[PDB]
Amino acid sequence: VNSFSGYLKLTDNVYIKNADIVEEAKKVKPTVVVNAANVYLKHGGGVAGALNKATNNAMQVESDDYIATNGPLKVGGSCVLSGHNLAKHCLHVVGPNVNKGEDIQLLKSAYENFNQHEVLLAPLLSAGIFGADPIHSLRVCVDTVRTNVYLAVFDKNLYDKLVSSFL
Length: 167
Ligand SMILES: CCOC(=O)Nc1cccc2c1[nH]c1ncnc(NN3CCCC3=O)c12
Ligand SMILES: [Cl-]
Fold this sequence. Notes:
By secondary structure, the chain is α/β, with parallel strands linked by helices. The protein has one domain: Leucine Aminopeptidase, subunit E, domain 1. The protein contains six helices and seven strands. It has helices at 21-28, 46-54, 58-70, 106-112, 134-144, 156-164, and strands at residues 8-9, 14-18, 32-36, 78-82, 89-93, 119-122, 148-153. The strands form two sheets. Strands 1-2-7-6 form a four-stranded mixed sheet, sandwiched between helices. A hairpin with a 6-residue loop joins strand 4 (78-82) and strand 5. Helix 4 packs across helix 5 (134-144). It is globular, with a radius of gyration of 14 Å. The structure holds ligand A1A03 and chloride ion (CL). The site of chloride ion has 4 residues, from helix 2. It is a multi-pass membrane protein.
């Protein structure tokens, strides 16, 4: 048993809710919140901008030190950093950005990072400003992640479409 509340169960291990991931994280304080990161960990907008804003820019400060030491992530890759006031840890995962021409096939690799964590609160990778079809992202999530994932979908109309179209 865990403290995630109000989720619809899609599969044995995937759950979904219409929620603002920032508010969900602040309420639940999960062990792991997933950020929709880019390779430079520049948290300017979308989920990343909102998560970083909620940390009063501490996420960005930590991220800039990480990049200065390690260089950029790979598309499809991840790193574990602090969750600040939102979670114990933040798993920064880079899904392919279709608006940059990045290979949508890398979305499966991105979701594989979730399997290193028993339970996660996460957004749909490559959705929103990353330009992929969220219905496709949900399918890849369900077919790739084997650990317990709680998906927060900000947009109510999209949430309803994701549920109603789920196979
Ligand atoms: C002050 C904090 O409040 C907010 O950021 N609210 C808010 C506004 C607009 C969109 C989202 C949002 N929260 C979200 N959490 C998670 N995925 C969000 N969108 N995506 C990104 C990919 C698919 C999707 O529904 C949003
Ligand atoms: Cl977004």
